[PDB]
Design a binder for this molecule. Structure first.
Ligand SMILES: [Cl-]
Ligand SMILES: [Cl-]
Lengths: 170, 170
């Protein structure tokens, strides 16, 4: 570690903080009826997008950080009590599975806030060496930590943006 | 500038490159009918989201970089020929203005690619000092270059994510 790591630490902290800010916006005043709206029968809903975004960030950050997902570490999976396998992230969900993801806004927000805390703790000490470390050799180009973190922000930003679009028409 | 600037340069290059990759995906096989779909009468369309995202990135990057927007520099505004004021970005658009933003997919992609080139040229030499420079004193907290760049990526990622959602239901 070196003092010049602070710039990339700040870029990462700011990017991840925008995601949690969107979660606060999306969940404020979010009712169950709005959270479950689907504009067409196969389309993703707000609740699914909020939950999937949090799950994806949890599993992917926990992998690069080498820690347990908060979903199981703190029993969030049991507080949600969804009719789904315990490890599900939504990556494998069919259109019908979307309707199973139903939870109060406070639980969607609380789980994402716990994932955000986990993420802040990992990125806070990020070094140049860690950013260039490869975490996935199965893809070409092999995935560095830097690329994986950018992938997480982008995927979650897209899903949270979709949820905001739906919140305006639901 | 210093060699330790490379880490933040790479984070920025990768984040902005994901946006242009989404543009390539969204515009491939995009017809005029799909580009203009609105799921409800007031909702934003794919063409508007692609154009607005490019305009926002152009004006905001050009401001921090101290250069001219590519929209006017290379006459993109005239190639589009939209029935709108020449400086419009979409920030001021009413629901009815959305229907005026209609352009072939190749022009939407070409303009975003020119904005992406402008962005790559700016972020390529990013230094720690530049990242902490304030570009907007009117907000509290005052906006640093680092925060502004994160804001641009996030806003554009959200709009491009919304366009991808619409492409799947249009
Ligand atoms: Cl799954
Ligand atoms: Cl405008």
């Amino acid at each position: 570690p070196a003092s010049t790591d602070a710039a990339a630490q700040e870029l990462l902290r700011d990017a991840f903080t925008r995601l949690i800010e969107h979660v606060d916006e999306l969940t404020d005043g979010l009712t169950d009826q709005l959270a479950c709206y689907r504009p067409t029968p196969s389309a993703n809903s707000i609740a699914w997008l909020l939950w999937h975004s949090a799950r994806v960030q949890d599993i992917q950050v926990a992998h690069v950080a080498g820690v347990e997902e908060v979903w199981t570490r703190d029993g969030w999976v049991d507080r949600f009590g969804l009719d789904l396998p315990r490890h599900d992230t939504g990556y494998g969900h069919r259109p019908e599975d979307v309707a199973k993801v139903r939870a109060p806004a406070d639980l969607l927000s609380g789980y994402y806030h716990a994932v955000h805390k986990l993420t802040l703790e990992y990125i806070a000490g990020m070094t140049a060496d860690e950013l260039s470390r490869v975490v996935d050799t199965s893809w070409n180009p092999p995935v560095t930590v830097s690329a994986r973190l950018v992938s997480i922000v982008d995927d979650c930003a897209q899903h949270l943006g979709q949820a905001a679009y739906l919140r305006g028409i639901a």
